[PDB]
């Protein structure tokens, strides 16, 4: 790897610089290098990894949707729209495969605490969900089940080990509800999960400090926003 010669601490420092510079491809490469040092990641380091790859794949997802819409409308201009949509699709799949590779070698198996294990399993669900968004052939069903299985394991741990206001637990429930609605064609499961998550978090807000209250209520507003859209 191109970052094998750089100190772990230097990789983390440069990831933070790249975030400030809005250089998210660089930030992702730096954090990939940090993960490959083999040590477990702190909560702040997991945030750097998450921010970097979410921004990279988010740009690819946005581009893919633009190109897929143009392609759908065209279906004569020749093969160029399909070719270029396929190009972006393959790059997107490559990023998802890279993230899933880091999680499987060996972030998840070394994650023993609830916050680390739930965060990584949520990540695994998210990047399979992104693969599912572009999947069509004999692989779409297996990709969807891989996302479901990762999210479900994360949910089982989070319900046993975290309070209902924990932001990792809340963001996991939010993303699993999006999975149900957008990917698995299960809007009623999505709505049920969103409502139950919101209501249990509401009842636990009284236990929080002002700083944790801010974090929990932000994700709860997103659950509400989706419920408004879905109903």
């Amino acid at each position: 790897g191109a970052m094998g010669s750089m100190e772990r601490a230097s990789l983390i420092q440069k990831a933070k610089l790249a975030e400030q510079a809005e250089r998210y491809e660089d930030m992702a490469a730096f954090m990939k290098g940090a993960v490959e040092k083999g040590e477990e990641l702190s909560c702040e380091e997991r945030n750097l990894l998450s921010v970097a790859y979410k921004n990279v794949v988010g740009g690819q997802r946005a581009a893919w949707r633009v190109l897929s819409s143009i392609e759908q409308k065209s279906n004569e201009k020749g093969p160029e729209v399909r070719e270029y949509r396929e190009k972006v699709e393959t790059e997107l799949q490559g990023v998802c495969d890279t993230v899933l590779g880091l999680l499987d070698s060996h972030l998840i198996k070394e994650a023993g605490d609830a916050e680390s294990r739930v965060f990584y399993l949520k990540m695994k669900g998210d990047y399979y969900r992104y693969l599912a968004e572009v999947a069509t052939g004999d692989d779409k069903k297996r990709i969807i089940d891989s996302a479901r299985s990762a999210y479900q394991e994360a949910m089982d741990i989070s319900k046993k080990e975290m309070p209902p206001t924990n932001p990792i637990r809340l963001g996991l429930a939010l993303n699993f509800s999006v999975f149900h609605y957008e990917i698995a064609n299960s809007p009623e499961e999505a709505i049920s999960l969103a409502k139950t998550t919101f209501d249990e978090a509401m009842a636990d807000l009284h236990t929080l400090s002002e700083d944790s209250y801010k974090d929990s209520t932000l994700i709860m507003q997103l659950l509400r926003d989706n419920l408004t859209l879905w109903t």
Partner: peptide, 9 residues
Amino acid sequence: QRSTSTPNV
């Protein structure tokens, strides 16, 4: 309109 997933901090 698309559903909202968890944002970046």
